[PDB]
Amino acid sequence: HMVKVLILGQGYVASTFVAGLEKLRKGEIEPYGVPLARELPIGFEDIKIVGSYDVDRAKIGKKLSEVVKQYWNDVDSLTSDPEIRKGVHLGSVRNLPIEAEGLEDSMTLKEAVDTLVKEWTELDPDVIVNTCTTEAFVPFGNKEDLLKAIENNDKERLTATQVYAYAAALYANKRGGAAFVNVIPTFIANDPAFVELAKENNLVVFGDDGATGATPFTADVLSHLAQRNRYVKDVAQFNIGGNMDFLALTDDGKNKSKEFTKSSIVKDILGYDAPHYIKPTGYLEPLGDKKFIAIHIEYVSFNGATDELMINGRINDSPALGGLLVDLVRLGKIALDRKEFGTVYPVNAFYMKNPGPAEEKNIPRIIAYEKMRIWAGLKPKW
Amino acid sequence: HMVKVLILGQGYVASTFVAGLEKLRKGEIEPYGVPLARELPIGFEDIKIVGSYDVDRAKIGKKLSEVVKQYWNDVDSLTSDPEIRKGVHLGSVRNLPIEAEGLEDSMTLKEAVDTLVKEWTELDPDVIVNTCTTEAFVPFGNKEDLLKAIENNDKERLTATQVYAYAAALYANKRGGAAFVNVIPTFIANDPAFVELAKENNLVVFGDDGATGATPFTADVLSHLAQRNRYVKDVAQFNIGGNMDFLALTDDGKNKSKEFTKSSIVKDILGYDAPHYIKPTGYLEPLGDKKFIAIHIEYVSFNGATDELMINGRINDSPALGGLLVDLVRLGKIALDRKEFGTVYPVNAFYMKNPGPAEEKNIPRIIAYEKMRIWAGLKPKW
Amino acid sequence: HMVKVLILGQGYVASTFVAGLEKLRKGEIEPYGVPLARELPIGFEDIKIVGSYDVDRAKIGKKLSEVVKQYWNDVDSLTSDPEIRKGVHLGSVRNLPIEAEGLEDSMTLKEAVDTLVKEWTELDPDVIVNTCTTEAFVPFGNKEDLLKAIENNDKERLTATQVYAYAAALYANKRGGAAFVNVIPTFIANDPAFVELAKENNLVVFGDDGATGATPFTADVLSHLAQRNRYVKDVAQFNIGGNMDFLALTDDGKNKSKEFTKSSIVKDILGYDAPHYIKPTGYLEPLGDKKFIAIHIEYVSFNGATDELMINGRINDSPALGGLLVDLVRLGKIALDRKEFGTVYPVNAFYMKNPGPAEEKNIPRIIAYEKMRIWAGLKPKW
Amino acid sequence: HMVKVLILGQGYVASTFVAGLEKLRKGEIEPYGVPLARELPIGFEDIKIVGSYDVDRAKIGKKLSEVVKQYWNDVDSLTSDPEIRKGVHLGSVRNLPIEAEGLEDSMTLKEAVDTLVKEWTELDPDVIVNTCTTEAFVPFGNKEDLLKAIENNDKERLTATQVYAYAAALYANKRGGAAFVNVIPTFIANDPAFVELAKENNLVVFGDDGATGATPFTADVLSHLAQRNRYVKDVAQFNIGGNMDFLALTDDGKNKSKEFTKSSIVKDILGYDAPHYIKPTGYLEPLGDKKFIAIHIEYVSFNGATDELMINGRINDSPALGGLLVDLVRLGKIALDRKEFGTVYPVNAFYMKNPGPAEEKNIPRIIAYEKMRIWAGLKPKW
Ligand SMILES: NC(=O)c1ccc[n+]([C@@H]2O[C@H](COP(=O)([O-])OP(=O)(O)OC[C@H]3O[C@@H](n4cnc5c(N)ncnc54)[C@H](O)[C@@H]3O)[C@@H](O)[C@H]2O)c1
Ligand SMILES: NC(=O)c1ccc[n+]([C@@H]2O[C@H](COP(=O)([O-])OP(=O)(O)OC[C@H]3O[C@@H](n4cnc5c(N)ncnc54)[C@H](O)[C@@H]3O)[C@@H](O)[C@H]2O)c1
Ligand SMILES: NC(=O)c1ccc[n+]([C@@H]2O[C@H](COP(=O)([O-])OP(=O)(O)OC[C@H]3O[C@@H](n4cnc5c(N)ncnc54)[C@H](O)[C@@H]3O)[C@@H](O)[C@H]2O)c1
Ligand SMILES: NC(=O)c1ccc[n+]([C@@H]2O[C@H](COP(=O)([O-])OP(=O)(O)OC[C@H]3O[C@@H](n4cnc5c(N)ncnc54)[C@H](O)[C@@H]3O)[C@@H](O)[C@H]2O)c1
Numbered sequence A, B, C, D: 001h002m003v004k005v006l007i008l009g010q011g012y013v014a015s016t017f018v019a020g021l022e023k024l025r026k027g028e029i030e031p032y033g034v035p036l037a038r039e040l041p042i043g044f045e046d047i048k049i050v051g052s053y054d055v056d057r058a059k060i061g062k063k064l065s066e067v068v069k070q071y072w073n074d075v076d077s078l079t080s081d082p083e084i085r086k087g088v089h090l091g092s093v094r095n096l097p098i099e100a101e102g103l104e105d106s107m108t109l110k111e112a113v114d115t116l117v118k119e120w121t122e123l124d125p126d127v128i129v130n131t132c133t134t135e136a137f138v139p140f141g142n143k144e145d146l147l148k149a150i151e152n153n154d155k156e157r158l159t160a161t162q163v164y165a166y167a168a169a170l171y172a173n174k175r176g177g178a179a180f181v182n183v184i185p186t187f188i189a190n191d192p193a194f195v196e197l198a199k200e201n202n203l204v205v206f207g208d209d210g211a212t213g214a215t216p217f218t219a220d221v222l223s224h225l226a227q228r229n230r231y232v233k234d235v236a237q238f239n240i241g242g243n244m245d246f247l248a249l250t251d252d253g254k255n256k257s258k259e260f261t262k263s264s265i266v267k268d269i270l271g272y273d274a275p276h277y278i279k280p281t282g283y284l285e286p287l288g289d290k291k292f293i294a295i296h297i298e299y300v301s302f303n304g305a306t307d308e309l310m311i312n313g314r315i316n317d318s319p320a321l322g323g324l325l326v327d328l329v330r331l332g333k334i335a336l337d338r339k340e341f342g343t344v345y346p347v348n349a350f351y352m353k354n355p356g357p358a359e360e361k362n363i364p365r366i367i368a369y370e371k372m373r374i375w376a377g378l379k380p381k382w
């Protein structure tokens, strides 16, 4: 009862996943932050990291342990310690102080994909996890346009995550099945082009955008208010932190993807589009990995009364998502074992803040949780 | 499709219920804050106030409208405008600047009860709502002890709500069925003595303690955290407001009832008794009916990370509960129509912060909501 | 002991100033929010509004009262009720849903200025108050460049406030003295070109940017921390509201003026430039005139300990500044009476968040307050 | 340029003072949290701990280092490491899980005092610091009543701090001068009996109650609001933490001292007694030494507008006060050198939240700071 995992993008999230998982297999900690903890048939010792890819010249060729220790100084070794390999960069790190290298510097995208597939066939992952830098993306919608983009080496059109998910389908087809977990904003689970390519190629997809940070807290409050028929007048959410990833996109890149990165959480939960201010995380270096959040919601109660809630928080970013990933990789192996190719909403609805497919929307997360337990073969919690 | 309602204790909650309901039947407002809004077969025009009782000499003999306007100056008339009648005081207002009068000043408790029953038989309510001053109570547990307390005129042992619920059972028996809604802390739904007396006497009981204020918000956050297996280190809740009721109990009365008024919300939701500070509402006069709340929760996430949430709010007390009551009276008539005597957990679990019976506990309120919709004959919301 | 006041830009601030002042002369309210209240020799009845200018075609030609009632419905008349006159628009309202008209549509800037001066000589104000829409400005630094900009009709170079302050100096010279109060961000007090033009032309200038909102609260906390030698690690400030003015500037206009609109409050108060996030107010329509603010500051205390403060607030924008203006117009008449031409730091330091001249900086506002009292001829408060 | 210091009560504050001071003399840290840092003529290496007293049987006879390491595990040695000596207990620890021992178990109070004085004459402190458990005290007002209480061995009347301050005066007289720093609530600086005894016996007194925690933050906001003539409607302050000292007083002891422990900060700063809720710190064990605070203030601004501020914080208790003590001991030696016997308001006003003498009150702390710098022979900061 094992799961082999390949990581794309060896940064803070990835390194916290690895370091946390090491402590969990070494019993140095309890699985707090891992929702399903030890309830699944796959134990923490049964999760094996078979590979890690990056585009940072400072990381490529280092052992996984050397990079993980840069984020978590207490990690001096790892049970599986593969060397970090070169991926495909496209535009990912163009705005960051990273010296980039990529397969597609010396070959076409189509060639780079075939090269990835060959490498991955030897590493043999069950689950590929995407923790790459946030991207100014535009979805395809039609598979034919994705295929043409690859065929024509259309680098200006594609993002790295789009190329990696494409490669994952080709890999899945050659391997007889695999899973791709997309915890970044780029539409994969929510792009019907990729859901169709996945269904056709023995690939399970979870996505998109890991459910951490302020937005899930806003959504929880909105769910409360909806139940009580309290009319939500406005919602303001502020989120700021010190991770370099928050500077990844130019104002232009943000403008280009805004149509797709805008949250639908408020209308999803309330049923009406209450005015809201929900934006990308701002940058302030000394906060490091621990975000400051501030949320303000005002609403109308009975007899014309008006109430206000102000939520503030300090939340550790990478650990939150790292813990979710411990479940998502094990759930990916279950979905693969069951041949549930395409995207799996019962999983996405709980773990993702933009749950795929495009035709499904966010629900209250307690409801999502109970339905996800049932999908996983567990009894509900309450 | 009608419901006749009798109110016990004509103060802020009661008067907001009445004033709000008047605007709702007059279409001057939408039913925000009324969870089931217009989904029930009983409409707002079909709720008739047939009586109101108090012990304040300043209120007894006034028209309901004259008292309601003291709380909501915009109310200049009411569709049903009964005169406020004298109840039984026992210790209720002993610590407040209220000149008290009570039936039991001129007769025994047993006589006072028979007098109430005779009055109520002429007013003919379906539903009796208890919005009296908070009480230093001690539950009975065994019906025999409740019966002996009444029989022996044991005024030092009993609170007003205990005497009123007893009277409600006798009334229910003479009438062929009625309902008693207890939105104050005193155990009625959670006192097996009263649940048994109710079952035997054609009385439906909802209780105890209306689910408003800070505690339901704390409970919602705890539910979120539990789902994610986040270990809750501590919970602090502060609540303060300007309502006279917050001064009702002496330090001694508080000490006497503390065993029973202590929240179990934290252990109920989490399954372990995380250290917590959750206390009665403090007094600060200029806040009036709009409470200030402050909640702090710290918890452990993945890889030993520690996060913190600080929730602040300004919430209008009496409107919140007033809106719940618009549903509870209609649900009481449904339970009565169905002959569901004793206490009804599917209702209590959503509307009450100490849901009866004593053998049931709090659950996440979204789960309670969906189960309450099903009980009411509605389709679930999400 | 009188002061005649001319308003430039008849919007929310201006209209709250007028409406508030009307209630103060009519004794309908106490001067809360007016720092010096009734301590000055000029009473509220002695402040006369002699004129109001706008560029909104919907406002030009209306009585002041008709426009004020749009903001404060309780105002049905005014003691002085002049018709709103046409100003100069330049780029002010280009990004707003306002149909603009301006003198410079039919004449050169130099001509428009001479026209303003002639109009103002008949209205005869002592004090001109600038409450116009926020502007993408670039200061001059050298008076010669300001003069050339006017002479050459260089509309692309100038903002309305720059043209109005220029006109104010010419007016002051013809009149024998006047004062210009700049409560918007555009550098006037902090542009040596204008300070020199003012000194030479019998003009007193107060500026720049009224001291209201979140920034003064952040500054107060920083002052506290500085005193205790607490090392400030980071400062994050979020501010959002529903006023149309918050949409006045494009991303480009913001980029153009950012060099000058960036706060120096943190380094001014602390002496070192702690990392900070302090940005323009964001837009969320239902908040209206009542801003939501959120501030987070973390700092190092003794023995390596680290503390955190989270401040949230709801603050009414236009009333705050309206109240300051009641003092600033009276202080302007005192400065004029004393012939203190140029800019007056003892006033600016308390009332303005970028106190002029360019060579002076922010100080703790309690210190500024006591020095401002001394300047005004009052005894200090504590 | 040296100062010898004796500590009364070797708990969290005391141990943080010692541990912090050790790091400061060893250059392992900068003096953050020490307001006057290195501006005084006495450097950190020049502060010598000559003694430490307790009543805990678990601490008496231990080296100072062994006790300090229980609070700060990083401390493995101290430059001066005296054995902890037995004090006088009276009622101090009666409500805590501490096995108490005291001189007055085997002798009268008068004898116990003479014994302390003899011990202290050999240890030879310049400055005695009182960091003992909070006490249910009642001040004397008249010195004659203090003298009679000691003479008559009136243990039920006296607290430990009262006996220690008395002993300090007798010690000061025998030594030719000393200083007593009272950072706990018990009136010493604010009890004219002790101020007179001190003046007569060559004793300098600083007191009372160290200026840390939520109250100084509330006071800072109030000072801001007062300046702007904003009318404060209400002030609510919540403070909770995990230190055992918060359980020191029974409800009865709290009732007995309430007349004296009630804050006057609001009226002191505003000049009118705005309704307020400011209470002793509540207990929640897992918070440890890091308090959670919540403050809510609502106020009236211009034109009838109403604003609200909600401040939340996590603040490390013992470090805050520990840092103040680094200054207070050096300032005590300066006051002693100057023969300024009695109490010194210029010091108290900045460092203490109930600044002595009884005839002086709190002022804005920035004003207190500048006056304290002037007293100390420094130039003001801004
Ligand atoms: N709680 C969270 O941290 C959170 C929540 C939801 C989503 N996310 C998303 O997760 C992603 C990772 O976040 P992070 O904080 O770890 O960021 P990070 O910058 O620390 O790490 C990103 C890593 O990806 C590498 N990389 C960039 N482009 C790549 C490419 N084309 N191929 C291979 N490697 C590439 C970078 O060099 C870096 O090592 C981001 O997209 C972020 O938006 C994070
Ligand atoms: N959101 C909320 O307001 C909220 C929430 C949960 C529970 N409650 C509970 O609801 C109750 C009512 O709250 P309120 O704010 O309306 O208080 P309130 O003081 O305004 O009104 C109480 C009324 O009951 C009357 N009364 C007191 N004892 C009585 C007796 N023995 N018989 C008849 N009348 C009596 C009083 O004179 C007064 O008119 C309290 O027990 C409170 O704890 C309130
Ligand atoms: N608390 C506060 O409201 C606050 C604080 C500091 C500064 N300010 C500044 O005060 C100014 C006014 O704020 P507001 O909320 O009243 O905005 P507003 O949009 O309500 O009013 C601005 C008015 O100026 C008019 N106007 C625009 N350009 C003009 C021009 N060139 N000549 C004459 N009239 C012109 C507009 O038509 C409108 O009537 C803004 O610059 C704002 O940044 C406001
Ligand atoms: N920021 C702060 O910690 C803060 C601020 C202001 C005031 N204070 C006050 O400082 C005092 C110390 O606080 P703490 O947190 O260090 O408490 P603590 O309980 O950790 O330490 C108190 C110590 O005093 C000892 N003690 C008790 N009675 C004594 C007696 N009669 N003689 C000698 N020793 C005695 C105890 O055994 C213990 O070692 C308390 O009065 C507290 O109210 C603390």
Ligand SMILES: [Cl-]
Pocket: A211, A212, A213, A214, A315, A320
């Ligand atoms: Cl999270």
Ligand SMILES: [Cl-]
Pocket: A212, A213, A214, A215, A239, A281, A291
């Ligand atoms: Cl977020």
Ligand SMILES: [Cl-]
Pocket: A216, A219, A220, A221, A223, A363, A364, A365, A366
């Ligand atoms: Cl949710």
Ligand SMILES: [Cl-]
Pocket: B211, B212, B213, B214, B315, B320
């Ligand atoms: Cl509520």
Ligand SMILES: [Cl-]
Pocket: B212, B213, B214, B215, B239, B281, B291
């Ligand atoms: Cl509450």
Ligand SMILES: [Cl-]
Pocket: B216, B219, B220, B221, B223, B363, B364, B365, B366
């Ligand atoms: Cl819940």
Ligand SMILES: [Cl-]
Pocket: C211, C212, C213, C214, C315, C320
């Ligand atoms: Cl303000």
Ligand SMILES: [Cl-]
Pocket: C212, C213, C214, C215, C239, C281, C291
């Ligand atoms: Cl602001």
Ligand SMILES: [Cl-]
Pocket: C216, C219, C220, C221, C223, C363, C364, C365, C366
């Ligand atoms: Cl300041």
Ligand SMILES: [Cl-]
Pocket: D211, D212, D213, D214, D315, D320
């Ligand atoms: Cl502090």
Ligand SMILES: [Cl-]
Pocket: D212, D213, D214, D215, D239, D281, D291
């Ligand atoms: Cl405190």
Ligand SMILES: [Cl-]
Pocket: D216, D219, D220, D221, D223, D363, D364, D365, D366
């Ligand atoms: Cl202060």
Ligand SMILES: [Mg+2]
Pocket: A190, A354, A355, A356, A357, A358, A359, A360, A361, A362
């Ligand atoms: Mg979707």
Ligand SMILES: [Mg+2]
Pocket: B190, B354, B355, B356, B357, B358, B359, B360, B361, B362
């Ligand atoms: Mg129960």
Ligand SMILES: [Mg+2]
Pocket: C190, C354, C355, C356, C357, C358, C359, C360, C361, C362
């Ligand atoms: Mg300046």
Ligand SMILES: [Mg+2]
Pocket: D190, D354, D355, D356, D357, D358, D359, D360, D361, D362
């Ligand atoms: Mg005093």
